[PDB]
Amino acid sequence: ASLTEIEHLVQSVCKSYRETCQLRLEDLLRQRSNIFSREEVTGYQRKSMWEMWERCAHHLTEAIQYVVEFAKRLSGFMELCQNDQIVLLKAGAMEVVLVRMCRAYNADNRTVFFEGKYGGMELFRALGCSELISSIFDFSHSLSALHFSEDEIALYTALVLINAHRPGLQEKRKVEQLQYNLELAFHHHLCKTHRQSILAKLPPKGKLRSLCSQHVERLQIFQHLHPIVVQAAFPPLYKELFSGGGEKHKILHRLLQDS
């Protein structure tokens, strides 16, 4: 590419992101005073473990559905082969959601927007995965310290998704080229906005892997405790991405095909 082409890529990525925001940033900020009461927190803590897992997996799956749309609108992604589209989304969809979630995190009081209000990590105690929860809160806290603009989130999440090192890619060089173009776009935009200082403060790629690994591991524990709950009440797309062996569901293929 060249300079105007790189700047065009920047604009295209930012537009794809804006169109596939689940929630506009301003909607999340306007809600920060709306905080769960102590009685409401208690109510969440008294929910059964399987009911809380089901609700959280539903919310995560809704978020992932917007990430799938983001990928479908992202320059170059639909030009990859379908094997590689699926490899990239299966490895990266959760990672993208985890980065996007920092927009819903309020570092002032350490709360996150959940089911219409802001609550702290004690809200999630019924899940019984306190280590995973605190890791996600800590990750969101780290990212909130950088004060990402929406444009920076768009360009950074594009690179989280377009990762040429994912095992299983059949056209690795094509993904490498797309990743390099997106890296240029991201770094060009940071240079233009005098924001290259954040490069050194971004999380290592092993950090996002660690969160996704913890999630899959806590899911395997839960699925052993409540196998029928997962079969009967978890979202099909969630099971295709995360459970074993749940990829007998072929939702992603359908999502990628239908316009």
Residue span binding ligand ENU (CB under 6 A) among the ranges 33-41, 131-139, 151-159, 174-182: 131-139
Q: Is 237 in the site for ligand ENU (CB under 6 A)?
A: no
CA distance 53 to 37: 21
Q: Which residues of 42-74 are buried (b: 16+ CB within 10 A; e: fewer)?
A: eebeeeebbebbbbbbeebbebbbbbbbbbbbb
CA distance 96 to 68: 10
Q: Is 23 in the site for ligand ENU (CB under 6 A)?
A: yes
Out of 8, 31, 76, 114, name the contact with ligand ENU by CB under 6 A.
114
Q: Is 233 in the site for ligand ENU (CB under 6 A)?
A: no
Sheet of 117-119, strands arranged across: 105-106, 111-114, 117-119
Q: Are 132 and 220 in contact (CB under 8 A)?
A: no
CB of 103 to ligand ENU, least distance (A): 4
Ramachandran bin of 194, using left for φ above 0, alpha for ψ from -120 to 50, beta for the remaining angles? left
Q: Is 136 in the site for ligand ENU (CB under 6 A)?
A: yes
Identify the DSSP state of 105.
E
Helices (H), the chain: 3-19, 25-29, 38-45, 49-73, 82-100, 130-145, 150-161, 172-192, 205-225, 227-233, 236-242, 251-257
Nearer to ligand ENU, 133 or 143 (CB): 133
CB of 79 to ligand ENU, least distance (A): 26
Q: Is 22 in the site for ligand ENU (CB under 6 A)?
A: yes
Residue span binding ligand ENU (CB under 6 A) among the ranges 77-85, 112-120, 161-169, 251-259: 112-120
Residue span binding ligand ENU (CB under 6 A) among the ranges 42-50, 70-78, 93-101, 206-214: 93-101
Residue nearest to ligand ENU (CB): 56
CB of 208 to ligand ENU, least distance (A): 14
Sign of CA dihedral 24, 29, 30, 34: positive
Q: Is 63 in the site for ligand ENU (CB under 6 A)?
A: yes
Nearer to ligand ENU, 27 or 79 (CB): 27
Q: How many CB atoms lie within 10 A of CB 7?
A: 15
CB of 85 to ligand ENU, least distance (A): 21
Q: Is 74 in the site for ligand ENU (CB under 6 A)?
A: no
Which residues of the chain form contacts with ligand ENU (CB under 6 A)?
Answer: 21-23, 53, 56-57, 59-60, 63, 97, 100-101, 103-104, 112-114, 124, 127, 133, 136-137, 215
